[PDB]
Amino acid sequence: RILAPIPSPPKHPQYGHLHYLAGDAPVLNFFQLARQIPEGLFQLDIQGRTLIQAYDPNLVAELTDERRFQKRVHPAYTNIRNLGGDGLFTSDSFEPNWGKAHRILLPAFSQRAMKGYFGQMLEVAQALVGKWERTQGQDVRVADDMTRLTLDTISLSGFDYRFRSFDKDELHPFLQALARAMHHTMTMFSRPPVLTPEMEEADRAYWADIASMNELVDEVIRERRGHGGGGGDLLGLMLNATDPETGERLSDENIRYQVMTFLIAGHETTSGLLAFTLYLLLRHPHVLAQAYAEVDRLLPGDAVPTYDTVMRLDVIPRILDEALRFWSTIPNYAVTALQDEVIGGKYEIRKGQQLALLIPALHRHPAAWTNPDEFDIDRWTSENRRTHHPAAYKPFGNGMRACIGRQFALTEAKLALLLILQKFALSDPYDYHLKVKQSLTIKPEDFALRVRERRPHERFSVPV
Numbered sequence: 001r002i003l004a005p006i007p008s009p010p011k012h013p014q015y016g017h018l019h020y021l022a023g024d025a026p027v028l029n030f031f032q033l034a035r036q037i038p039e040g041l042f043q044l045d046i047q048g049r050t051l052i053q054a055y056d057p058n059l060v061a062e063l064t065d066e067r068r069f070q071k072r073v074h075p076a077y078t079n080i081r082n083l084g085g086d087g088l089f090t091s092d093s094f095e096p097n098w099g100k101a102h103r104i105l106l107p108a109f110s111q112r113a114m115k116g117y118f119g120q121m122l123e124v125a126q127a128l129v130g131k132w133e134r135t136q137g138q139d140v141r142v143a144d145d146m147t148r149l150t151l152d153t154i155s156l157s158g159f160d161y162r163f164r165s166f167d168k169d170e171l172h173p174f175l176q177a178l179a180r181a182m183h184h185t186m187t188m189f190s191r192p193p194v195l196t197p198e199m200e201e202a203d204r205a206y207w208a209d210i211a212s213m214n215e216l217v218d219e220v221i222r223e224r225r226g227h228g229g230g231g232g233d234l235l236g237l238m239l240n241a242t243d244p245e246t247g248e249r250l251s252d253e254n255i256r257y258q259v260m261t262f263l264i265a266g267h268e269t270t271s272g273l274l275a276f277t278l279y280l281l282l283r284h285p286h287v288l289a290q291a292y293a294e295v296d297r298l299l300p301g302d303a304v305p306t307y308d309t310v311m312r313l314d315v316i317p318r319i320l321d322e323a324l325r326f327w328s329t330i331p332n333y334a335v336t337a338l339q340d341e342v343i344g345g346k347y348e349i350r351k352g353q354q355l356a357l358l359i360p361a362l363h364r365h366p367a368a369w370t371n372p373d374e375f376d377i378d379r380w381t382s383e384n385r386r387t388h389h390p391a392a393y394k395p396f397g398n399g400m401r402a403c404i405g406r407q408f409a410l411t412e413a414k415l416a417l418l419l420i421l422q423k424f425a426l427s428d429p430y431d432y433h434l435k436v437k438q439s440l441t442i443k444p445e446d447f448a449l450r451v452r453e454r455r456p457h458e459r460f461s462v463p464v
């Protein structure tokens, strides 16, 4: 109009910008376009909508300003809200139950709260190690076993339910329902207006699944309020805690939604972090050797780790942070424009437009990361960490709407890597070619490794 236009790449009357949306992982197509447009952002004119991907660290520092751009439930989250409800992940900050749930749960997710969950985390991690011990020489299904690990951990810490997912290949009917529900939610975005016979019955089953999950969690709540409530659990906490400002408690409906919300937002994000980390250690095996050495200094023999142990880790935490930089598992979350705004002093953003953070480009943008495409766990160290661009690492969201579960997922995954590397030697039997699938989150699809028990003489410890 009087300033610069956002760059748009055109490709034939055949197709359009729509080809950039096909495939298992569109965010990766966006990443390929961001490497060839150094301006810092681009736009796709899809039919009926405009999508703006931003990745320059200074343009992102602008989009991070909650005074101008904020999370907005409408469009993007409206389907996932079918089962997220008004819980933390699928509500706007100005809805009463967001402020309430935030102010109540924030302390229960703090780093100080983690020690109290460590027992349950360790139970689930040892279950996983057991399954792999019992199947040495068999193909380990990495995505699936991490899904099990984290789904079980967040259920056990979230409402003290044990799905015992390492006892049997079949998942509990509740988790099968969760799985079907989530996938239907992701396909609901592509809605052909004519509804096929099978689509209408898909929807019937969809709300039936949502109902059967609501039913199990409603019953757990009923049965523990009957026993006096007050477990040392996220559900135990929500049954009793009062909001510091409103003085009231969460409703029963909101508590069921927060439990569903823990499951939605916490299982595939964390399991993907672990799937990817294992892939990266397999393709950067000198780092994996460093990890082995850390494990053999702190967990020699059949030592059983404590929360303290996890806290004294160094290699494994930085492996995890750098892994998040390569493959952040929620890669394309959008901020909405509160008012018409001008970014970089250059581009024209109309009120209510979605700016998707292209996390892959941002985390690998060479302006902020010398040698962007190379794995260095030493980038994260106290001193080198302070040298990073302050808006270019955003694996856990932004501001008021940043992931509450960060410390939960990071302690869970430190523990997982610790116990796995303690007991197992990893092998890649098939030349795994990374294959990314995107839903709410991105994750490796057909990853298979093999494990042997580590022989005593293969530990880098100091003898008894």
Ligand code: HEM
Pocket (backbone or CB within 6 Å): 071, 088, 089, 090, 102, 154, 261, 262, 263, 265, 266, 267, 269, 270, 273, 328, 329, 330, 333, 334, 394, 395, 396, 397, 398, 400, 401, 402, 403, 404, 405, 406, 408, 409, 410
């Ligand atoms: C590595 C694992 C995880 C990563 C990378 C991650 C990342 C993120 C990101 C990027 C967001 C922002 C979403 C948006 O603004 O649209 C978010 C939100 C959220 N995540 Fe996580 N998350 C992880 C694990 C977890 C876990 C384990 C929990 C709890 C069990 C959790 C609970 C939440 C919640 C409640 C929100 C909404 C925050 C609010 O509105 O107050 N996340 N997460």
